[PDB]
Structure 1
């Protein structure tokens, strides 16, 4: 006879779920539309029209949608597959119907780990930062809404830092000092709860300097010194101090607390007689030299030297 019946699906739409762990060729859904108008015209030919985006395919005669060749399914991905049941009458006398498949990609067994907003974090702290002061909230959220367990794993042997098990706030647990340790680099972890479900991340704490160390003089350098009389710019002796702080806070500058019209001092701390010294006038000069770090909010140190002038 003629073509008299339209190839029809039983439903309008299909919600079906797909996973990350799937491989090419794995069956997604068997769609079967009835035409039942027997002839060439009773014989159906399926086809995805649009919305597969290269990650899906249907077998023409069977009506079976499968994962396409060579594709990796990204998680949390929407797809809407319009699939067309075409009957095999001539093009003139053809009939068509449509059906839409609504798919979402999931994680393997639908449970990713909890993920951090970043893979690395760069912090900065002053060694002077108050104990208990919060450094960083590590709010790593969990796709499925599971409860999170935070904890540091490596990079903190001291436990100088405390990461709240529940809240993910990173407080400071013991007092910082920069000379002890100049920077910490932690490894931190969120837990889904099961072993498969745990992400990692790295925090890079960098401690910055305060002037909390006065320049200390070398203990062994000579304090009891000699000089020749009747000589301007004559060498007397040398002092030396150091500062375990850094920057301008590390640089030491030598100054004289007395006798600065008589004696002078260099950048390096060498002391010279600025004028023609004399034994008949003054054979005991008890001089005090001062080291001051060249810093904002500076610190001082003193050293009384014992200079006794000789003649020859």
Structure 2
């Protein structure tokens, strides 16, 4: 009497870049009915924000809306092809994985202190620590710290910790508006900057 239409594979897998263009063709999951019927394809579940379009007649699966892997990096679509009959409808499952692009700069924790203090006449003295984070993946969110001024006076480490490079002298200067630069280790790198306000104190004798 009846066989339902059969998808080639009963489970698909697929990478898509988050930068992929709207309208781009992602997968061809057309089935065939052995008694030549017309077939109707629909995404039953797995795509609540309607990111993907699955042609009702063709079978083609394209991208409908823009992706972002910082919001969603994975989808599990439940697709169906049906012929019309009471139970002439079959189910496959597409498994989609979104891959990274470096579309995000480091961002400094706004809650850590900016106003810092270090004693004078002391070198390799701990001034304080900053931190910045990047939501991108792998090297695209590895953050490298550097100083944008006073490089002869202060050094900064990979863990964000800042030190005096040399004995400072309050009488020479007591405030420093230091600048820190967080940069991601991506091939096409992005960065941001934070100004600190460092104050010099003195040992109390002379």
TM bucket (normalised to shorter chain) is: over 0.9
Q: What is the deviation of 1:284? A: 1.6
In our comparison, the structure showing a higher alpha carbon Rg is: 1
Q: What is the deviation of 1:242? A: 0.8
* 1:218 and 2:116 correspond: no
Alignment counterpart, residue 265 of structure 1, candidates 134, 138, 156: 156
1:191 and 1:165 mapped to 2: Cα distance? 10
Deviations 1:252-299 (A, max 9, x none): 111111111110011100100011111122212111000001112111
Deviations 1:54-78 (A, max 9, x none): xxxxxxxxxxxxxxxxxxxxxxxxx
TM-score by length of 1: 0.64
List gaps (5 residues or longer) in structure 2. none
Secondary structure in structure 1 of the residue aligned to 2:12: strand
Secondary structure in structure 1 of the residue aligned to 2:193: strand
Deviations 1:206-264 (A, max 9, x none): 00011111111111111111111111100111111111111111211111111111100
Alignment counterpart, residue 67 of structure 2, candidates 176, 194, 207: 176
TM-score by length of 2: 0.96
Deviations 1:92-145 (A, max 9, x none): xxxxxxxxxxxxxxxxxx321111010111100001100110100112111111
1:215 and 1:236 mapped to 2: Cα distance? 22
1:304 corresponding residue in structure 2: 195
Secondary structure in structure 2 of the residue aligned to 1:279: coil
Deviations 1:1-59 (A, max 9, x none): xxxxxxxxxxxxxxxxxxxxxxxxxxxxxxxxxxxxxxxxxxxxxxxxxxxxxxxxxxx
Q: What is the deviation of 1:195? A: 2.2
Moved over 3 A (4+): none
Equivalenced residue count is: 203
1:155 corresponding residue in structure 2: 46
Q: What is the deviation of 1:197? A: 0.6
